[PDB]
Amino acid sequence: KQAAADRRTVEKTWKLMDKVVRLCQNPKLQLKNSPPYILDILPDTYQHLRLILSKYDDNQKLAQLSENEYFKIYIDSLMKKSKRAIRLFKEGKERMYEEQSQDRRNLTKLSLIFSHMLAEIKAIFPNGQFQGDNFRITKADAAEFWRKFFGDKTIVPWKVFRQCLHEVHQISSGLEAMALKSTIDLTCNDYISVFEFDIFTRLFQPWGSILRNWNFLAVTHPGYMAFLTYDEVKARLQKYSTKPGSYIFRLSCTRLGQWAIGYVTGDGNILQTIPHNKPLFQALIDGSREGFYLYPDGRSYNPDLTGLCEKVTQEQYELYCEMGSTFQLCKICAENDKDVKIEPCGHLMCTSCLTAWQESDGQGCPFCRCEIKGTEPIIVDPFD
Numbered sequence: 001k002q003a004a005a006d007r008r009t010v011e012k013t014w015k016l017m018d019k020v021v022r023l024c025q026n027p028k029l030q031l032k033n034s035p036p037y038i039l040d041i042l043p044d045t046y047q048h049l050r051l052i053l054s055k056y057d058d059n060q061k062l063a064q065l066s067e068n069e070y071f072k073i074y075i076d077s078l079m080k081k082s083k084r085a086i087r088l089f090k091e092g093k094e095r096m097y098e099e100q101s102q103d104r105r106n107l108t109k110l111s112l113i114f115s116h117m118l119a120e121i122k123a124i125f126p127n128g129q130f131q132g133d134n135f136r137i138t139k140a141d142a143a144e145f146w147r148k149f150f151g152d153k154t155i156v157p158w159k160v161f162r163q164c165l166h167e168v169h170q171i172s173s174g175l176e177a178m179a180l181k182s183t184i185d186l187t188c189n190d191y192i193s194v195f196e197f198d199i200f201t202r203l204f205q206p207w208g209s210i211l212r213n214w215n216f217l218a219v220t221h222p223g224y225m226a227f228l229t230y231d232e233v234k235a236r237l238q239k240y241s242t243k244p245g246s247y248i249f250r251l252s253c254t255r256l257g258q259w260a261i262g263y264v265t266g267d268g269n270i271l272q273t274i275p276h277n278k279p280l281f282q283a284l285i286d287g288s289r290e291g292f293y294l295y296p297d298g299r300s301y302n303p304d305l306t307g308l309c310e311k312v313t314q315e316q317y318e319l320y321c322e323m324g325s326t327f328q329l330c331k332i333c334a335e336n337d338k339d340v341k342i343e344p345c346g347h348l349m350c351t352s353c354l355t356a357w358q359e360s361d362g363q364g365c366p367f368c369r370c371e372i373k374g375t376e377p378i379i380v381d382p383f384d
């Protein structure tokens, strides 16, 4: 239940965003030349919110804008993530100037979220005018699923989304649904917009086997590198510059919904290819056959991807989730946040999962089997 997105509220986010920009202007961090460039994303976010206000330039237009379900979620999320970034500098202290630290890692995670939020608002409010109820989902079979379950909604809670997705593509576990959430919920706000749904369905098409494509291509494929800048792709492949056909595929925060395959050419150079509006597995199959994509991440074994033309372990889902921000999500249901701690073992879960466990098995903690001497409500930050 977020507050109305009135002018007063919108401006509170600008002041919080200016605070993040000031903290990030410190030369000790060296963030001026540090992607995704938070010192560029936050001013651009300001200019977009300003462009939107110019389009809703009267009291009646401001009343419609402040009631817009997507806009309220956006401003509330922008507010939350900005406060989170200020809190990161407050508690990180000198560990913010060390590039390998977890505090710096969390700032890169926040910088990626602000990048995704900016691309989202520009897609939903092109030219500052709301067009979410007329957003074009690139895949028709994915568009039909969205229209079927959510009508003309532009954004829906993750918990409603997951359940409706399960009705068409079965999700096998709590860890799989958590890995899935960190993949689709790019803005890390516990909601899925039609834009985030379009990116996910473009990346892992065809829709008919989208969870098999995602499990193979992203959860277990050695060639998958998640978000990388081109300099990082080159740095990764430089080790294998002596092995033509070495390759990796990555996401690009400036080309959402598309893949970029970086590869070692016969003459030692590192080049990249952006596949067309076709499945990534077909581009990898064609490239393997043609001698360009042979060794994923320089490794001799290239997985057989032909099965996708016509089994992931719980540990693999756990490693996959580490990169994202899902530590606050209940591992059992993957739909509610952790809000209770079991005493004395310290394991965490949501209130309703603990009540369900207590009425079903209840013979110790559902994770370690230790006797439940007590419970204590808690608030979990994604970076705890």
Ligand SMILES: C[C@H]1CCCN(Cc2cc3c(c(C(F)(F)F)c2)CN(c2cccc([C@]4(c5nncn5C)C[C@@H](C)C4)c2)C3=O)C1
Residues within 6 Å of the ligand: 035, 036, 104, 105, 106, 107, 108, 109, 110, 112, 182, 183, 184, 225, 226, 227, 228, 229, 232, 251, 253, 320, 321, 322, 323, 324, 325
């Ligand atoms: C663009 C450049 C900027 C400098 C850091 N490098 C490396 C880097 C990549 C990711 C991250 C970091 C860091 F913040 F943890 F530090 C760092 C985080 N990160 C990230 C954050 C949330 C979700 C994901 C996805 C993912 N891929 N494998 C597992 N997961 C959960 C890709 C989404 C569709 C789901 C990835 C990177 O890609 C990326």
Ligand code: NA
Residues within 6 Å of the ligand: 184, 185, 186, 187, 188, 189, 190, 191, 192, 193, 196
């Ligand atoms: Na989201």
Ligand SMILES: [Zn+2]
Residues within 6 Å of the ligand: 330, 331, 332, 333, 334, 335, 336, 349, 350, 351, 352, 353, 354
């Ligand atoms: Zn739960």
Ligand SMILES: [Zn+2]
Residues within 6 Å of the ligand: 342, 345, 346, 347, 365, 366, 367, 368, 369, 370
């Ligand atoms: Zn326990």
